[PDB]
Design a protein around this ligand. Structure first.
Ligand code: GNT
Ligand code: GNT
Ligand code: NAG
Ligand code: NAG
Ligand code: NAG
Ligand code: NAG
Ligand code: MG
Ligand code: MG
Lengths: 528, 528
């Protein structure tokens, strides 16, 4: 039977799923690690012990324990990211969508979800892989990994909570795909990892980590890069946050062993209830437990690895969306609200910049404010609102990604850069938010091809070309089918817009602002 | 006789001069101080001892000793600023153009020439006052003052070379006008001092100096303000330059008395031959001997005087030209030449910024470069050339003037701001220079009304409205004849363009760049 597959870990039984008036096979909830529960909480993952009998893979697995968003109870724009399955620390599973009839050796894509390293699920409706698998004839995999303290609490030097274990979860799933995807019809030598935001940062982290490089062929990064300012911390800051977490739960802090034992007896929700109290600054776009520059998973600083070409050399396809900052300003900056046009006063602008660049001294905050203010019209509420969206987006997503692409391209084997700027016709978020962080995903997973979802015919067509660009790149290392998406080069720096209008090629994506964020401001903060 | 005038210092005999097919009286070369020669070199000026008999005032006086421009021998654009009379340390004289028949009590305007405080003459063809006196029926005075080391060598603490003596020369001429202009038909209560560049800085310095305020009624400043970065130095820097001058002439440096005695035995040209060797940095737009913040002529720092309203409160009319930096870049920055279009390489741009902001550290030079570079097109030769013109102009002329007008307006009694951007049809300087520092003067003095000079009929008309705006302001404190030039206010900050097109009103003259030069960069250099 097409729904039965024997892997090196055991037999697995999938289920048939309807898709656009046809059907494909799905193997949901395949375990790739031992449940990281009890004394295994905070530990590196262990491979799943092989099982006899048939694993029932007909239903989605539990989602990892995480902070649930209650900012807009019941609002769909918000609920679409929340766990849609019961949460459990027993959550290390992966999902596979396989074309029917079963391929022999086809292109494989493995999705890594985002969620600021503190949330995320492989089971969300926007990540349903049946459309992409079906439409492009690829074997589509979505993995999962521990988030929040469970995935990233780091007490460097300790073997019990070393940090980065969520990244090791991703790697273990990638090892499992490398070892077993051939049985599902996938070519393990043509595995493309792709992910958005913390998932895109994760993809870049596997490109950098010597221990992950050999497990995949090429990479796609959507609105995230490894060097994002929110994506990692030093071992000293990670240690400081772990100790502050213990301090919030009245833990014995005399030793790492004491702290970890205490943290392991707490129920999951108790850690989540105080997770946000350990940030060092009042800030937006900063998350508590994230990857640590540890000397193991990351051998040296990310910048020296990038500078010296110490990373996997292959082809990459990546990009950003037009209004990367709006989501975070809505959730945490003064003056923004979901149901108003959010015109921002001069004062709220200044407190927004302080929140956006938490690590900056006063001269630094002045430089940002000067750079983003139109001084002939400084009380313009729309301009201040949009200026803050650019500050947040440029500092946290865009300029770090432009820095990564320029460093990468010098040693890589092919780069394709995009700028996604289509505002979905059925977007439920207010107009002032624009093209929001995360909202290109639905186009990548082909949701616009299902009628009940209400997209325009042109949005369906944009989704189909994005899916074909992504799958053709996964297959060949070039999104173009032999109107061209040009290669991004060190000299030319070309990229394309991704929207419903005829393709336009541009150059040096937000260079002006990124020279400020990547070269000037760090020099300024260093001298002062 | 209309050409005979008896003043408190003695009788003076003028001469009749033809002007636009009519005639007026001129009293040229009237002495207002004792010749500052011999042991009087570097000393405060002494009032001219009254004389019996009739002073022959039919011809122009000698020009003060100064560095003569040989950068373009015989070229008219350059020669028009050079002394056109024999140079002599005996040069403290003033000139008066008087309408015919002689007025009883009319509006008086006193012109103070520029020349970077190191050069300048009251006798230049572009300063011929007959056209303005004639056309607007005003008594026009042009004074003179010592420049270079002779006017500004400063050994603070010494009474022999205290500094600022050139400013005291101007004040003495203003005292003479106050005491005697009534005899020539001028109303001493309606005296407007006006001047360009170092002459405009000088005008602002008399607005600030308690000892000059009472001598005039209102003021006009053209492309200069007291707080310009090149217009003054501390007493320590002035002292250091005087000692370096002596060191260049092998002077005994054991004491102020020794240094001054040595400097007083040198012929004028010997001091001028080494004048430029005392600048502290390789720089452009910096001059050796200039006003000193001494605690006497200037009681405290210029900024605290401006901040506290410690200055003459009256009406002011002032402005700048479009391309204030081009003249200085031509003369001293790499890549610029008089006979090429002067497209500037990225490299020459960077060495131009280093030359333009001599006092800045490397972070400071980076901030300027970032602010003026179009990073999507950084090798564009025209853009780099124009960017440098703006850097020089904004840092040295425009932003200091915008800072002065905003501080002044808070306490003043009426401000009128202009932006002169007409490129003369007969300009002999290359096109790339644009609307050059100093080139609005010919319009202010009405040269476009003389046919042989070859201006267009519209340029003649622009000159006539500028002359009428200036004289009406001198007369009434408002350039408008009862299409309006609006008052510049703290709230609105309006100004008008001055050119051959219908008047346009704008707001916040170069605010974006001036917030960088007046607020950001000084804070940056202070923190680093
Ligand atoms: C830095 O990236 C993020 C930080 C926090 C959140 C998200 C992030 O990326 C967004 C889109 C997708 O990756 C998943 C979660 C996001 C949308 C839902 N919530 C509530 C929070
Ligand atoms: C800072 O202002 C100046 C510094 C140097 C010079 C001039 C300046 O202003 C210019 C126009 C007018 O004021 C007189 C001299 C200038 C034109 C002639 N030369 C050679 C030099
Ligand atoms: C697999 O699990 C689902 C739901 O838990 C169930 O309906 C289905 O029949 C199961 N298959 C087997 C044979 O276990
Ligand atoms: C990628 O590598 C192959 C050889 O290993 C080379 O021929 C090709 O030009 C490279 N492509 C790019 C864009 O560097
Ligand atoms: C004034 O001086 C000029 C030239 O020096 C001379 O031609 C003129 O006649 C003089 N007038 C008298 C009477 O001194
Ligand atoms: C100038 O001063 C007079 C009174 O001294 C006042 O009435 C007038 O409004 C003032 N003008 C301005 C523009 O301040
Ligand atoms: Mg935006
Ligand atoms: Mg210019």
């Amino acid at each position: 039977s097409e729904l039965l597959v024997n892997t090196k870990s055991g037999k697995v039984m999938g289920t048939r799923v309807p898709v656009l008036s046809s059907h494909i096979s799905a193997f949901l909830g395949i375990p790739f690690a031992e449940p990281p529960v009890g004394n295994m909480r905070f530990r590196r993952p262990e491979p799943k012990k092989p099982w006899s009998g048939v694993w029932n893979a007909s239903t989605y697995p539990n989602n990892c324990q995480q902070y649930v968003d209650e900012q807009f109870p019941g609002f769909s724009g918000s609920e679409m990211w929340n766990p849609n399955r019961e949460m459990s620390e027993d959550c290390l599973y992966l999902n596979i969508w396989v074309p029917s009839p079963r391929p022999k050796s086809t292109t494989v894509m493995v999705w890594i979800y985002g969620g600021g390293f503190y949330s995320g699920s492989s089971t969300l409706d926007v990540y349903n892989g049946k459309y992409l698998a079906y439409t492009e004839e690829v074997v589509l995999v979505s993995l999962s990994y521990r988030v929040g303290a469970f995935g990233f609490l780091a007490l460097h030097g300790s073997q019990e909570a070393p940090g980065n274990v969520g990244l090791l979860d991703q790697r273990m799933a990638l090892q499992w795909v490398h070892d077993n995807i051939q049985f599902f019809g996938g070519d393990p030598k043509t595995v493309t990892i792709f992910g958005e935001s913390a998932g895109g940062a994760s993809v870049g982290m596997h490109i950098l980590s010597p221990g992950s490089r050999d497990l995949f062929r090429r990479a796609i990064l959507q609105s995230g890069s490894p060097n994002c300012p929110w994506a990692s911390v030093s071992v000293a800051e990670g240690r400081r946050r772990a100790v502050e977490l213990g301090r919030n739960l009245n833990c014995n802090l005399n030793s790492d062993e004491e702290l970890i034992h205490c943290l392991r007896e707490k129920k999951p929700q108790e850690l989540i209830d105080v997770e946000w109290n350990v940030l060092p600054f009042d800030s937006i776009f900063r998350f508590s437990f994230v990857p640590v520059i540890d000397g193991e998973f990351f051998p040296t600083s990310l910048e020296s690895m990038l500078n010296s070409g110490n990373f996997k050399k292959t082809q990459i396809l990546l990009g950003v969306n037009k209004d990367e900052g709006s989501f975070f300003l809505l959730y945490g900056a003064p003056g923004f609200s979901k149901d108003s046009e959010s015109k921002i006063s001069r004062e709220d602008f200044m407190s927004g910049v302080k929140l956006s660049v938490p690590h900056a001294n006063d001269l630094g905050l002045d430089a940002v404010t000067l750079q983003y203010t139109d001084w002939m019209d400084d009380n313009n509420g729309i301009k201040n609102r949009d200026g803050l969206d650019d500050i947040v987006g440029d500092h946290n997503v865009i300029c770090p990604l432009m820095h990564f692409v320029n460093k990468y391209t010098k040693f890589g084997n092919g780069t394709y850069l995009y700028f996604f700027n289509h505002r979905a016709s059925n977007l439920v978020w207010p107009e002032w938010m624009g093209v929001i962080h995360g909202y290109e995903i639905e186009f990548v997973f082909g949701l616009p091809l299902v009628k009940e979802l209400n997209y325009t015919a042109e949005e369906e067509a944009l989704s189909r070309r994005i899916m074909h660009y992504w799958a053709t790149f996964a297959k060949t290392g070039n999104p173009n089918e032999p109107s061209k998406w040009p290669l991004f080069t060190t000299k030319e720096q070309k990229f394309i817009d991704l929207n419903t209008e005829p393709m336009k090629v541009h150059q040096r994506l937000r260079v002006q602002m990124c020279v400020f964020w990547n070269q000037f401001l760090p020099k300024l903060l260093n001298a002062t």
